[PDB]
Design brief:
alpha+beta, 10k-s Protein, Hypothetical Protein A, Chain A, Chalcone isomerase, two-stranded antiparallel sheet, binds 2-(4-hydroxy-phenyl)-chroman-4-one, chalcone isomerase activity, isomerase, flavonoid biosynthesis, Chalcone_isomerase, CFI
Length: 212
Amino acid sequence: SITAITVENLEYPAVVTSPVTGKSYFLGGAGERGLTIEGNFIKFTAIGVYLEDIAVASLAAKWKGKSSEELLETLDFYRDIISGPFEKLIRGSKIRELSGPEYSRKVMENCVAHLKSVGTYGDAEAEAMQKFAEAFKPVNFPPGASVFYRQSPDGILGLSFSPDTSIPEKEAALIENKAVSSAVLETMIGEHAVSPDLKRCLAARLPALLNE
Ligand SMILES: O=C1C[C@@H](c2ccc(O)cc2)Oc2ccccc21
């Protein structure tokens, strides 16, 4: 039943399969991010969050039978999605052109704030974030180009870059750090993520799946 979602002419298929891990995912939600300039929301990128198919069985126990409205207001629900025992794939496709450094600046800012916020920002995490930064430096994201974050439940964050929206065969880098591995998704649907579009998609789409 899960449908595809299109954001600013950028389409997010209902399902995708990783060329890296071979695992298949379903679209949990899609939205957009940007900057508010002079009270005006300026869109820069689209974001899609895919959850490994096994996520359903994992989330079923605790969340089956809950209404979308109920899930949306429950922080614990999103915590299970962020740190659940399954892989998550996040695809960011640019609406406006951004260089790797330009784009990564904000993302890293948000990740670092979160990490410090929960008391897990030591030397290992700073080094992981520096490696994160390094991976983006040689990259440019013209409209339509994409970044793929593969959040492995084993504490690893795989980074892939594409000239368009197709998922690359090989990953550009592997950030091996547990706390950092979930930081990116946390800044998107975690408690302190202001933008609700992704959270709403998840709360709306998951109930149907959690019942069958
Ligand atoms: O996926 C993104 C894009 C990022 C961003 C937007 C505009 C820009 O110029 C640089 C980075 O903002 C964000 C903030 C929070 C969570 C995800 C994101």
